[PDB]
Design an enzyme around this catalytic site. Sequence first.
Site, PDB file in Angstrom:
ATOM      1  N   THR B  11      53.298  17.078   7.238  1.00 64.56           N
ATOM      2  CA  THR B  11      53.358  17.163   8.683  1.00 64.56           C
ATOM      3  C   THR B  11      53.013  18.630   9.069  1.00 64.56           C
ATOM      4  O   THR B  11      53.200  19.546   8.260  1.00 64.56           O
ATOM      5  CB  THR B  11      54.810  16.733   9.078  1.00 64.56           C
ATOM      6  OG1 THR B  11      54.818  16.581  10.493  1.00 64.56           O
ATOM      7  CG2 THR B  11      55.872  17.729   8.643  1.00 64.56           C
ATOM      8  N   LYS B  15      46.374  17.892  11.039  1.00 69.38           N
ATOM      9  CA  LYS B  15      45.719  16.588  11.121  1.00 69.38           C
ATOM     10  C   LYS B  15      45.141  16.321  12.515  1.00 69.38           C
ATOM     11  O   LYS B  15      44.014  15.829  12.618  1.00 69.38           O
ATOM     12  CB  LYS B  15      46.631  15.348  10.903  1.00 69.38           C
ATOM     13  CG  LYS B  15      47.144  14.921   9.556  1.00 69.38           C
ATOM     14  CD  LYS B  15      48.166  13.732   9.690  1.00 69.38           C
ATOM     15  CE  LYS B  15      49.520  14.104  10.350  1.00 69.38           C
ATOM     16  NZ  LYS B  15      50.157  15.285   9.732  1.00 69.38           N
ATOM     17  N   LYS B  37      46.150   6.655  17.439  1.00 72.85           N
ATOM     18  CA  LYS B  37      47.327   7.156  16.739  1.00 72.85           C
ATOM     19  C   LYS B  37      48.328   6.013  16.955  1.00 72.85           C
ATOM     20  O   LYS B  37      49.000   6.009  17.984  1.00 72.85           O
ATOM     21  CB  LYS B  37      47.824   8.471  17.381  1.00 72.85           C
ATOM     22  CG  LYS B  37      48.829   9.129  16.404  1.00 72.85           C
ATOM     23  CD  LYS B  37      49.353  10.473  16.852  1.00 72.85           C
ATOM     24  CE  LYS B  37      50.627  10.914  16.081  1.00 72.85           C
ATOM     25  NZ  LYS B  37      50.343  11.472  14.767  1.00 72.85           N
ATOM     26  N   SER B  41      55.853  10.204  17.091  1.00 72.29           N
ATOM     27  CA  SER B  41      57.219  10.558  17.373  1.00 72.29           C
ATOM     28  C   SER B  41      57.151  12.030  17.788  1.00 72.29           C
ATOM     29  O   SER B  41      56.381  12.813  17.192  1.00 72.29           O
ATOM     30  CB  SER B  41      58.073  10.297  16.083  1.00 72.29           C
ATOM     31  OG  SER B  41      57.681  11.050  14.941  1.00 72.29           O
ATOM     32  N   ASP B  54      49.769  14.824  20.600  1.00 73.58           N
ATOM     33  CA  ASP B  54      48.691  14.548  19.651  1.00 73.58           C
ATOM     34  C   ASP B  54      47.822  13.354  20.056  1.00 73.58           C
ATOM     35  O   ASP B  54      46.583  13.449  20.111  1.00 73.58           O
ATOM     36  CB  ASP B  54      49.285  14.347  18.241  1.00 73.58           C
ATOM     37  CG  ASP B  54      49.902  15.627  17.639  1.00 73.58           C
ATOM     38  OD1 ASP B  54      49.672  16.763  18.070  1.00 73.58           O
ATOM     39  OD2 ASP B  54      50.623  15.462  16.679  1.00 73.58           O
ATOM     40  N   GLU B 115      44.584   8.060  13.131  1.00 75.01           N
ATOM     41  CA  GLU B 115      45.368   9.198  12.675  1.00 75.01           C
ATOM     42  C   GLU B 115      46.762   8.700  12.308  1.00 75.01           C
ATOM     43  O   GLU B 115      47.362   7.986  13.117  1.00 75.01           O
ATOM     44  CB  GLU B 115      45.466  10.232  13.778  1.00 75.01           C
ATOM     45  CG  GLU B 115      46.055  11.525  13.294  1.00 75.01           C
ATOM     46  CD  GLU B 115      46.362  12.583  14.331  1.00 75.01           C
ATOM     47  OE1 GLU B 115      45.797  12.584  15.412  1.00 75.01           O
ATOM     48  OE2 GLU B 115      47.179  13.453  14.049  1.00 75.01           O
TER      49      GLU B 115
HETATM   50  N1  ADP Z   1      43.166  25.869  12.729  1.00 75.97           N
HETATM   51  C1  ADP Z   1      44.256  26.165  13.404  1.00 75.97           C
HETATM   52  N2  ADP Z   1      44.347  27.389  14.005  1.00 75.97           N
HETATM   53  C2  ADP Z   1      45.489  27.740  14.654  1.00 75.97           C
HETATM   54  N3  ADP Z   1      46.519  26.899  14.730  1.00 75.97           N
HETATM   55  C3  ADP Z   1      46.477  25.685  14.156  1.00 75.97           C
HETATM   56  C4  ADP Z   1      45.325  25.287  13.468  1.00 75.97           C
HETATM   57  N4  ADP Z   1      45.542  24.079  12.998  1.00 75.97           N
HETATM   58  C5  ADP Z   1      46.754  23.688  13.359  1.00 75.97           C
HETATM   59  N5  ADP Z   1      47.317  24.691  14.088  1.00 75.97           N
HETATM   60  C6  ADP Z   1      48.627  24.585  14.796  1.00 75.97           C
HETATM   61  O1  ADP Z   1      49.589  23.976  13.899  1.00 75.97           O
HETATM   62  C7  ADP Z   1      50.405  23.055  14.641  1.00 75.97           C
HETATM   63  C8  ADP Z   1      50.289  21.683  14.017  1.00 75.97           C
HETATM   64  O2  ADP Z   1      48.955  21.173  14.196  1.00 75.97           O
HETATM   65  P1  ADP Z   1      48.774  19.604  14.308  1.00 75.97           P
HETATM   66  O3  ADP Z   1      47.336  19.263  14.334  1.00 75.97           O
HETATM   67  O4  ADP Z   1      49.515  19.069  15.446  1.00 75.97           O
HETATM   68  O5  ADP Z   1      49.398  19.017  12.968  1.00 75.97           O
HETATM   69  P2  ADP Z   1      49.692  17.577  12.388  1.00 75.97           P
HETATM   70  O6  ADP Z   1      48.845  16.487  13.180  1.00 75.97           O
HETATM   71  O7  ADP Z   1      49.289  17.631  10.960  1.00 75.97           O
HETATM   72  O8  ADP Z   1      51.136  17.289  12.529  1.00 75.97           O
HETATM   73  C9  ADP Z   1      49.935  23.066  16.080  1.00 75.97           C
HETATM   74  O9  ADP Z   1      50.828  23.886  16.829  1.00 75.97           O
HETATM   75  C10 ADP Z   1      48.544  23.663  16.008  1.00 75.97           C
HETATM   76  O10 ADP Z   1      48.131  24.368  17.198  1.00 75.97           O
HETATM   77  C1  DSD Z   2      57.282  14.536  14.022  1.00 77.33           C
HETATM   78  C2  DSD Z   2      56.054  14.711  13.127  1.00 77.33           C
HETATM   79  N1  DSD Z   2      54.965  15.334  13.875  1.00 77.33           N
HETATM   80  C3  DSD Z   2      55.502  13.346  12.644  1.00 77.33           C
HETATM   81  C4  DSD Z   2      56.531  12.597  11.791  1.00 77.33           C
HETATM   82  C5  DSD Z   2      56.851  13.160  10.423  1.00 77.33           C
HETATM   83  C6  DSD Z   2      57.636  12.142   9.610  1.00 77.33           C
HETATM   84  C7  DSD Z   2      57.995  12.773   8.280  1.00 77.33           C
HETATM   85  C8  DSD Z   2      58.464  11.781   7.233  1.00 77.33           C
HETATM   86  C9  DSD Z   2      58.805  12.465   5.913  1.00 77.33           C
HETATM   87  O1  DSD Z   2      59.877  13.076   5.772  1.00 77.33           O
HETATM   88  O2  DSD Z   2      57.954  12.412   5.027  1.00 77.33           O
HETATM   89  N2  DSD Z   2      55.179  12.481  13.781  1.00 77.33           N
HETATM   90  C10 DSD Z   2      53.918  12.279  14.212  1.00 77.33           C
HETATM   91  O3  DSD Z   2      52.950  12.581  13.515  1.00 77.33           O
HETATM   92  O4  DSD Z   2      53.768  11.733  15.299  1.00 77.33           O
HETATM   93 CA    CA Z   3      51.213  18.176  16.757  1.00 81.60          CA
END
Ligand code: ADP
Ligand code: DSD
Ligand code: CA
Lengths: 224, 224
Positions: B11, B15, B37, B41, B54, B115
């Site tokens: 996480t 992604k 998606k 959560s 997201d 996703e």
């Molecule tokens: N290439 C990037 N440069 C700066 N910040 C990033 C980058 N990639 C992700 N982040 C930051 O990391 C956090 C998680 O990114 P996110 O795409 O939502 O992750 P995931 O979908 O894997 O949970 C966000 O706050 C996002 O702005």
């Molecule tokens: C809250 C996080 N960002 C994510 C959920 C993470 C579940 C983690 C499960 C684990 O412990 O492996 N939810 C989401 O992608 O919408």
């Molecule tokens: Ca996010």
Amino acid sequence: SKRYFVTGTDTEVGKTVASCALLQAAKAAGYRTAGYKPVASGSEKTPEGLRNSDALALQRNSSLQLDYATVNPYTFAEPTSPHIISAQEGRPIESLVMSAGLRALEQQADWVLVEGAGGWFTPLSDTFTFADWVTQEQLPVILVVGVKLGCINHAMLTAQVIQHAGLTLAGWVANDVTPPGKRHAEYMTTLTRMIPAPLLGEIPWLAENPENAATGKYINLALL
Amino acid sequence: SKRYFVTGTDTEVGKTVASCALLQAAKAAGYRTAGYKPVASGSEKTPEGLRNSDALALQRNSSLQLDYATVNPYTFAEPTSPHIISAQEGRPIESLVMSAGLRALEQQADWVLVEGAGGWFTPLSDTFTFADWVTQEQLPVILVVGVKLGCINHAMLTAQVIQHAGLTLAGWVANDVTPPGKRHAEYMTTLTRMIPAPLLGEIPWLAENPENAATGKYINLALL
Ligand SMILES: Nc1ncnc2c1ncn2[C@@H]1O[C@H](COP(=O)(O)OP(=O)(O)O)[C@@H](O)[C@H]1O
Ligand SMILES: C[C@H](N)[C@@H](CCCCCC(=O)O)NC(=O)O
Ligand SMILES: [Ca+2]
Ligand SMILES: Nc1ncnc2c1ncn2[C@@H]1O[C@H](COP(=O)(O)OP(=O)(O)O)[C@@H](O)[C@H]1O
Ligand SMILES: C[C@H](N)[C@@H](CCCCCC(=O)O)NC(=O)O
Ligand SMILES: [Ca+2]
């Protein structure tokens, strides 16, 4: 000798803190113990050479008086993947040396805990990972899980891979890297249901210096 | 329709940022795109119901004008594992509903990116994980790797498990979650050598708001 390999769901999840708890419980059971960290990266300079803090924690929690090089034959200063700094320095990490060190400890100890570096697949060279050595040696494996969001996925990935290599997963340890959070009980129930091996104990969040703390009481060694 | 599932090494590895880059590249190639998606959560209250950031990023990076519920049928407020909050709320996550939503998008789009939530093994109920649904649907998988210490192990664990399920790993994306660090080149070379699928591109560290940034140029869609 009883021999166990300790791995983690990631780097910095408490593998060393949990290994000190396991060593303390084994000493309390009456075993002659030795901790072994064959490869370590992230180390300080001293008059005697480089010294790694995790290897020092294993050395002082062992029941036997052991020399540092016996606990940790390969010591690298930079905190990165071992295969990068090994190549950079011109010092090969040899499987024969890691195995010889384990045999040397079995001359004096009857309960040996071998601690890896990072998680399961940490590379030791461009063609050899830590998992290859564990498989070669046919060591039973203890998984340490740092309890935090994302740990169910990493615990299940590591469990499946060990089992597909034909190795035994002897058990798992839950380590509380953060204060009490809202879904701690539900995370513990899911992890218990999904990891196919016994929960050996849970180490609580201990702000001050959990390597030195008396944590043996949190492990039930009868399950190993 | 071309269909791809996007997973991550953990996480909060980017992604969603990488999915917006993939969608932008596909639109530039001339596809009618849709992001999906199915479970989310960690969501905010609005006049219209709960909305996840997201899912909103995927909705505004799709080329078609899409309704929020079509992009994200299951929205939960608390940022935890979906199976915990689903049970707590009395709202089952049904495989049939997730599959129906994918079919509904294929009526309007010819390039659909699905996703996941968290990493590979995120539980959706006590007997069903996200990986079970991906296997059922036989979706090819894109792995997003957040480049940081510990990511070699998590990238190799996820790759092995997908391959053992008989699924295709279509490729991987490197995402730079931190500023330039000392062993960035060496980490990139190791990950390229070890993951058995093409590197589709690398997204740089972008301090301000990388979901809104023009990142399609970092992906080479010809490799998919
Ligand atoms: N290439 C990037 N440069 C700066 N910040 C990033 C980058 N990639 C992700 N982040 C930051 O990391 C956090 C998680 O990114 P996110 O795409 O939502 O992750 P995931 O979908 O894997 O949970 C966000 O706050 C996002 O702005
Ligand atoms: C809250 C996080 N960002 C994510 C959920 C993470 C579940 C983690 C499960 C684990 O412990 O492996 N939810 C989401 O992608 O919408
Ligand atoms: Ca996010
Ligand atoms: N139970 C705990 N309570 C408080 N801090 C912990 C706990 N477990 C680990 N930590 C802290 O997390 C860091 C990493 O622990 P460590 O055992 O060295 O991890 P690893 O061997 O997995 O790399 C250390 O700074 C340690 O003090
Ligand atoms: C520096 C860390 N603590 C650890 C090494 C982590 C290697 C990570 C490899 C990877 O990216 O998976 N070293 C050690 O356990 O001695
Ligand atoms: Ca440490």
